[PDB]
Design a protein around this ligand. Structure first.
Ligand SMILES: CCCCCCCCCCCCCCCNC(=O)[C@H](CO[C@H]1O[C@@H](CO)[C@@H](O)[C@@H](O)[C@@H]1NC(=O)CC)OP(=O)(O)OC[C@H](COC(=O)CCCCCCCCC)OC(=O)CCCCCCC
Ligand SMILES: CCCCCCCCCCCCCCCCCC(=O)N[C@@H]1[C@H](OC[C@H](OP(=O)(O)OC[C@H](COC(C)=O)OC(C)=O)C(=O)NCCCCC)O[C@@H](CO)[C@@H](O)[C@H]1O
Ligand SMILES: CC1C(O)C[C@@H](O)C(C)(C)[C@@H]1CC[C@@H](C)CCC[C@H](C)CCCC[C@H](C)CCC[C@H](C)CCC[C@H](C)CCCC(C)(C)O
Ligand SMILES: [Cu+2]
Ligand SMILES: [Cu+2]
Ligand SMILES: [Cu+2]
Ligand SMILES: [Fe+3]
Ligand SMILES: [Fe+3]
Lengths: 923, 98, 48, 48, 48
């Protein structure tokens, strides 16, 4: 009886929040860039951060201000303190009484008055000024909330009797659901009233807190003169279950919304979203008497696209059906056939609009598996698309491939595992890939009824491969397209973007070709080779792209010597930069050959000498323009004895330098415990030659346990002026890195250092000297000295002499930070703590997140400005009551010393102060 | 109809906090004076305080007018079968501020 | 304004109100209510 | 049809009303076609 | 004490309905006039 009472009882969960807060600022800069970075790269926790960490948009705690109640993001350029503070953002008044906001330090540059608006002289001269000061008037807030949770025992459903011509028994199937429900008192700030059914908040839908006054917030509170507060009670629930399965042994029928299914690639790659609402039936004949050892299986799908959706949507009156059948006659070779169809009904043929084909009918067969020591992967498809309209003129498009290679479990092809193995280690000829491709030009995700895909995933990386992990397009080979200059509006000149990149028009050409990658394992020797030619579907050599190559390695004792030859002959246009540095579209010929020798004495040390020679379009081509990466079979070898693996990808980042110019911390990464500067490569294949010693601390029997350094020298070829055939190895790069953690006593030291003396502009790094050093100390609590002190520390210096074609400017930075925590302070359970941080910078800047996956970074700019961010943060604690105080100042002067901080132009820095009293309480 | 609670939620225990350090937690027990329950209908003097002053300004909301069917005779949320529906509110009063 | 005539011949619409005149907006002022009903296929989950 | 407790119901019906001549007035858009109705349902009763 | 707890306790009753439906017609006639009539005069049950 007690269990029955508990099953359908409410758990009452009240919550109380108590806290005092005051904050005064004049510019709202950011202070999270001063705090130490943890070994996982996260910044140390403080009581002043505004938050804002978003992985989707790349936002971090360092992209927003931390004072007042405002989280104003930092603004790049001069409007912000070069990414250090908030923008100036004048306000512009209009004649009709409307207003706009101008984001700049000079309103005169407001070059965007709308068509009919005229600046009315209402403010200073029609331009106002948005106040840069934010205030949080000191107050103590008590927040009270209450929720009612359920026992969570309603996770099952049992079927009931049904039928009209008959009556089912009932209680035959038990389904596990994922319903999470309870009672809430108040609505979240992000709730809304969805009046359209799209499931998303359109333009100002309802603001559910505004629909139910008194639900939450401060705008409305349903009160009582006696002091009572009333809040509406809502029933909140999530239903994560949309599929219901019936039947156990041979036959299982699943009914639900947005059914996800997969016949094969090129036909019903309809998982990762699903296609619509309906049912799927799966029949497994693995226990049949006569034929059950072949594991016969049948799948059948019926559904309506997107369920019910309004007209003008692609899935209105459109229904899909399909059936697949497969077996495994041999060890693992599964062979299957499948029929798929999608079409409009009489209500979709009329009043649907869009462009969905009147009918698509695809047939196919596949032979994936591993049977007799070899792995086969084949696929055939036929489309027969009915292109709506009136005449239609049904169009057919096939897609066939046959590959002898190893597919992973995620259906991506692993080209590093042979799958042939025609011998042992002494004589070990290994076939890695052997494939043919006949994808037609018109075969897209509509031809074979899928969600996405069947197009080059990169067009710059391996562009014959359609495999797209983002959209779940599991398909080995892609529908290639031909690229050409656009010339949309202007005539005579090709259209370009603002950055100068070309604008291309892509026409699908399909794909047809073959490719073999193999390697023969000798004894102390090993050899490998690859060949690959792909044309358009029609076979015209105007779209051919052939890559051939081969490598040979000899490794013995502690010496290894490799030699690689790579070619790329692309009559296919290809987009790339020329010698001058302007993007172009046109055929390419790349010839590379690299001989690199390595010696490993075994004491953790290593030495490496290399000579790599690129040759683009017949000229020596100081740097290849990424063309060699257009093929998916690169297959270089690796140094070391007994390492005869022919792994795909030309390891161009081997024994060469790094060209990074961005960093999370103020100093050039030498103060970031999540960045190993000695393992930073450029990943660009150069025409150069050089040597590089080093030392690894993770390798056992090393001189120093945790020590890594990467001293190295190199010389890079550069043409005579810009495009001359003649040239010389005039460029010179001398680089060095070091990293040493150690733990002397109770403290935990960490040293990092980097150097560079480049002579030319390699990828984006200018030509000049570049050095950096950083030290991090973190003492554990001392149990001998009174107060149990626990110290910290941080120092970082960065220097760079950027010799760019527009200046010879020096960009240096200096970051420091110290702090001591007293874990035993007078009264019991009393703690005190103080941390002082500082960051000075010459011509450097911060670039905030771009709103995409890219994050913000500190870089060098020629802005003649010196930033002087400083702050002190004192955190004391009684038993569990935390007093946090913080005072920070940001001043950005110029060479003269004008002190542009606090940009009202009064010669005063921006200042921020905060005081908080925090107290966490639980019921 | 009203729904009263057991009245056993008269205590709070502090939790660990701090950024430069971390307090032990469960160190202090505070006696609070929160009286809460569930009501079905609103009183006559209830109102929607849209300014924060805590007092009824000139015709603020007349909370019975905001939620029709809460109380009174002006509005009654009914059903042809004879059922009567009244919104459920979570009423609470906090007398503790220190 | 619009009205609905329930008959197989709109010419027999002997009931134009006091001041209303048939505007030649449809075929000749008379439309035609579609006789086709559609329930687009969907799977519905209702929770209470 | 019915599997354990999942009921598949399908129905196709046709209504044609001709005159003596054979004008086939059904589906009264006057195109000589009968009225037609088709339905497909999948029903599943579940209990907590 | 258990009886006192049960006297003023809530019984939580959740309900879930799952079902797929599609229907296409051009005139919307009636089909219940075709089904057999039961001994009590009611027409046989159907899913349409
Ligand atoms: C145990 C249950 C027994 C069966 C119950 C009675 C049903 C059979 C009687 C004939 C009834 C089925 C006859 C086939 C109609 N045809 C369909 O497929 C249409 C497809 O829509 C649209 O597609 C376009 C391109 O695709 C075009 O063709 C359009 O023109 C078409 N729309 C239109 O204009 C409407 C004709 O679906 P629908 O909207 O009519 O949906 C319902 C259908 C039919 O229902 C079933 O019978 C399925 C039962 C499967 C249970 C499998 C589970 C087994 C459990 C052990 O369901 C399908 O999907 C299947 C497709 C037909 C194959 C049938 C053989 C298993
Ligand atoms: C385990 C079991 C799982 C069960 C669930 C899976 C169900 C599998 C169903 C398999 C049925 C056989 C398929 C035959 C394939 C013929 C190959 C094929 O699809 N033909 C293509 C297409 O066809 C049109 C289609 O033909 P269709 O015969 O498919 O439909 C008839 C009937 C549907 O009945 C209803 C409900 O009205 O369905 C059946 C078979 O019962 C049709 O007439 N619809 C009129 C409307 C035209 C637009 C779709 O016309 C051209 C393009 O307009 C062209 O592109 C052709 O290549
Ligand atoms: C009968 C019965 C009963 O009444 C009482 C009691 O016995 C039961 C209840 C168990 C029962 C029910 C039994 C029930 C379970 C049904 C049996 C199960 C099987 C599974 C059904 C399907 C069998 C068909 C089979 C799967 C097809 C095989 C063909 C291959 C797919 C062909 C592939 C070839 C490809 C194209 C080559 C590659 C070519 C390219 C170019 C692509 O490389
Ligand atoms: Cu911040
Ligand atoms: Cu739809
Ligand atoms: Cu997929
Ligand atoms: Fe919406
Ligand atoms: Fe008020």
């Amino acid at each position: 009886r007690i269990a029955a009472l508990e099953r359908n009882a409410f758990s009452v969960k009240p919550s109380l929040t108590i806290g005092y807060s005051v904050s005064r600022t004049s510019r709202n800069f950011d202070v999270d860039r001063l705090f130490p970075l943890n070994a996982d790269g996260t910044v140390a926790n403080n009581a002043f951060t505004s938050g804002g960490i978003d992985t989707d948009t790349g936002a971090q705690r360092r992209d927003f201000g931390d004072f007042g109640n405002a989280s104003d993001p930092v603004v790049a350029g001069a409007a912000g303190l070069y990414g250090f503070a908030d923008g100036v953002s004048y306000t512009v008044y209009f004649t009709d009484g409307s207003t706009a906001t101008f984001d700049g330090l000079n309103p005169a540059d407001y070059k965007v008055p709308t068509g009919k608006v005229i600046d009315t002289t209402k403010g200073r001269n029609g331009f106002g000024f948005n106040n840069l000061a934010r205030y949080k008037e000191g107050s103590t807030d008590i927040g009270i909330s209450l929720g009612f949770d359920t026992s969570g025992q309603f996770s099952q459903v049992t079927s009931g009797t049904g039928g009209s011509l008959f009556s089912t028994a009932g209680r035959l199937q038990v389904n596990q659901i994922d319903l999470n429900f309870g009672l809430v008192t108040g609505l979240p700030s992000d709730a809304y009233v969805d009046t359209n059914g799209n499931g998303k908040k359109d333009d100002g839908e309802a603001t559910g807190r505004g629909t139910y006054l008194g639900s939450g917030g401060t705008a409305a509170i349903l009160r009582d003169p006696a002091g009572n507060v009333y809040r509406p009670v809502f029933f909140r629930f999530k239903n994560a279950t949309t599929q219901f399965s019936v039947g156990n042994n041979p036959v299982i029928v699943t009914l639900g919304q947005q059914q996800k299914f997969y016949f094969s690639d090129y036909v019903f790659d309809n998982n990762y979203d699903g296609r619509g609402d309906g049912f799927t039936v799966t029949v497994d004949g693995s226990n049949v008497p006569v034929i059950g050892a072949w594991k016969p299986q049948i799948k059948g799908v019926y559904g309506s696209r997107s369920g019910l959706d309004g007209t003008a949507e692609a899935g209105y009156g459109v229904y899909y059906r399909g059936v697949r059948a497969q077996i495994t006659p041999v060890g693992t070779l599964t062979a299957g056939i499948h029929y798929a169809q999608e079409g409009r009904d009489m209500f979709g043929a009329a009043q649907n609009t869009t462009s969905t084909p009147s009918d698509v009918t695809t047939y196919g067969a596949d032979l994936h598996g591993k049977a007799f020591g070899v792995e086969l992967h084949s696929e055939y498809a036929t489309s027969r698309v009915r292109p709506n309209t009136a005449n239609a003129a049904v169009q057919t498009s096939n897609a066939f491939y046959a590959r002898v290679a190893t597919r992973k479990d995620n259906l991506a092809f692993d080209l590093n595992t042979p799958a042939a193995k025609f011998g042992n280690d002494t004589f070990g000829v290994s076939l890695y890939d052997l494939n043919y491709r006949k994808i037609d030009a018109g075969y897209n995700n509509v031809a074979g009824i899928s969600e996405y895909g069947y197009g080059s995933y990169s067009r710059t990386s391996a562009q014959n491969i359609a495999y797209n992990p983002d959209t779940g397009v599991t398909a080995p080979f892609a529908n290639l397209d031909r690229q050409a200059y656009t010339d949309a509006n202007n005539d005579g000149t090709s259209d370009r973007n603002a950055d100068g990149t070309v604008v291309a028009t892509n026409t699908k050409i399909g794909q047809m070709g073959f490719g073999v990658k193999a390697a023969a394992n000798l004894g102390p020797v090993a050899i490998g080779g690859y060949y690959d030619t792909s044309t358009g579907a029609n076979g015209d050599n105007a779209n051919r792209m052939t890559e051939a190559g081969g490598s040979a390695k000899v490794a013995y004792s502690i010496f290894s010597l490799r030699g690689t030859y790579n070619t790329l002959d692309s009559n296919r246009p290809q987009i790339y930069r020329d010698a001058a540095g302007t993007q172009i579209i046109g055929d390419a010929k790349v010839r590379r050959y690299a001989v690199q020798a390595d010696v490993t004495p075994g004491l953790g040390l290593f030495v490496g000498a290399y000579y790599r020679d690129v040759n683009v379009n017949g000229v020596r081509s100081t740097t290849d323009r990424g063309l060699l990466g257009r093929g998916y079979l690169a297959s270089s070898f690796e140094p070391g004895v007994g390492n005869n693996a022919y792994r795909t990808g030309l390891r161009c980042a081997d024994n060469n330098f790094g060209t990074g110019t961005r960093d999370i911390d103020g100093v050039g990464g030498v103060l970031n415990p999540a960045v190993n500067l000695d393992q930073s490569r450029t990943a660009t294949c150069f025409t150069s030659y050089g040597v590089e010693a080093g030392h690894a601390g993770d390798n056992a029997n090393a001189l120093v346990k945790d020590l890594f350094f990467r001293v190295g020298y190199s010389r890079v070829y550069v043409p005579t002026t810009a495009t001359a055939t003649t040239g010389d190895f005039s460029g010179s790069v001398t680089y060095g890195d070091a990293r040493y953690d150690r733990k002397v006593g109770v403290a935990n030291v960490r040293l990092a250092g980097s150097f560079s003396t480049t002579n030319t502009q390699l990828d984006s790094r200018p030509a000049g000297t570049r050095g950096a050093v950083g030290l991090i100390v973190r003492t554990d609590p001392l149990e001998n000295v009174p107060f149990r002190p626990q110290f910290n520390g941080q120092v970082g210096y960065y220097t760079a002499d950027n010799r760019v074609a527009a200046g010879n400017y020096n960009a240096n930075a200096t970051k420091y930070g110290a702090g001591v925590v007293l874990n035993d302070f007078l009264l019991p359970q009393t703690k005190i703590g103080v941390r002082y941080d500082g960051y000075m910078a010459q011509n450097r800047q911060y670039t905030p997140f771009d709103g995409d996956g890219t994050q913000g970074y500190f870089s060098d700019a020629n802005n003649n400005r010196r930033t002087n961010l400083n702050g002190v943060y004192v955190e004391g604690a009684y038993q569990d009551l935390i007093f946090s105080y913080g005072t920070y100042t940001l001043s950005q002067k110029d060479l003269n010393g004008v002190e542009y901080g606090s940009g009202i132009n009064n010669g005063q820095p921006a200042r921020g102060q905060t005081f908080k009293i925090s107290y966490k309480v639980n019921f």
